Amino acid sequence: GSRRYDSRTTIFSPEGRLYQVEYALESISHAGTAIGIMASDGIVLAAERKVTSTLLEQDTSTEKLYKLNDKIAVAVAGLTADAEILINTARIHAQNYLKTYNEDIPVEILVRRLSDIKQGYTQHGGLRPFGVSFIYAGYDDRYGYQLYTSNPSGNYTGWKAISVGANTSAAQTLLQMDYKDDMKVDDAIELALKTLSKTTDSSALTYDRLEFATIRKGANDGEVYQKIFKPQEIKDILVKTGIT
């Protein structure tokens, strides 16, 4: 019967590894690099689009940075279509929580839920896992500014600064060198762009190959603002930080 054609997507190897998770991680290592850096007064998300064309409509384009709600955003590395399935699910969980408790969902509770969904595809159902790693940037009034990552295994961890996608080994070393705890958002913006500038496989880093976002309490008085940068605004911050 049908058994003959079954790849068995949810089995251990003899070393106790999950084949499909490992191979999904290999896929993700060719995606454009995404970086998150957490400061005392906010969070930066910076990511590189994969090799662009002059005819691509950039100002209407989104491939890396997505809004989950007003307080939480994600950077994507991997299969974009897979990411949008999970993103829409996370948007719904956040609204379910807000409806139930009349409070915005704490960042970790959202992250744990999405990570549990990924985990399920590795243990039952015989389906392939999602080829996606996320960086979550968000704020809540319990822990304040937070950074997390999750990957196809459904494992998640918290970070002060982190990268996913291509060249994370190089990127992580560079972040670890220059990151300091008392650092501010404007300093974090510069560190993120400098790190992408050095790790990129492109010839130079220009505005049309970047997506950029900040989460700041630079919204007037005890409240948080998300800013997805426009193409002209990415162009200005490249000049201002002296990369172009």
Partner: protein
Amino acid sequence: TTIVGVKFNNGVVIAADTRSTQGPIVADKNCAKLHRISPKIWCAGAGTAADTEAVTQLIGSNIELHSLYTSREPRVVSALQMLKQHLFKYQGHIGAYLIVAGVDPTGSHLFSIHAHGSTDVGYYLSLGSGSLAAMAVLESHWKQDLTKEEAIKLASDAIQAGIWNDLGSGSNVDVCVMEIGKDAEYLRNYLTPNVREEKQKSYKFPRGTTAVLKESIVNICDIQEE
């Protein structure tokens, strides 16, 4: 509500009044009761207003998809069959009573449909609380081989009978004419015989008349930058 349908030479016309009520109270004085199922298939509904709207939109949606699938213009018998099978299944609980009229490649058509799922064919029909007043006019003046102008006249006269004689009907007359080989022409407020007379007095108040405890600006803007 008063609604009628009249067949003529080269097409069909439907008409309706414009009053909607909540018991004895007039909720809306200029309601639109003529709905579009498709460009050249229009219907008018009596009964539960939400049901007539909803059932009309649903079948209209499915008719549009059917037309796209078949590469053919919608037929009135299709709208009819889809409406009656939907209504029959809900055993009268969807309180939709409709007059369905239209033109298609097969010709011009006029049907009525009852909430339990029964349909009928005719050259002239009337539905709603004003249907008996309207039918009295139609039975007095209808004849075979009407012209477009004669049918519009007869249809609006039938609606007027309901407007003046039925308490459930009032205000204005809406008409839609579906002629073979032509665009359907929707004539909103074709007649306007019930304009309110000027009041004796203006009831505009001096400013500061109303007592106020608190004022405050409401923030409708999103969270601001900087």
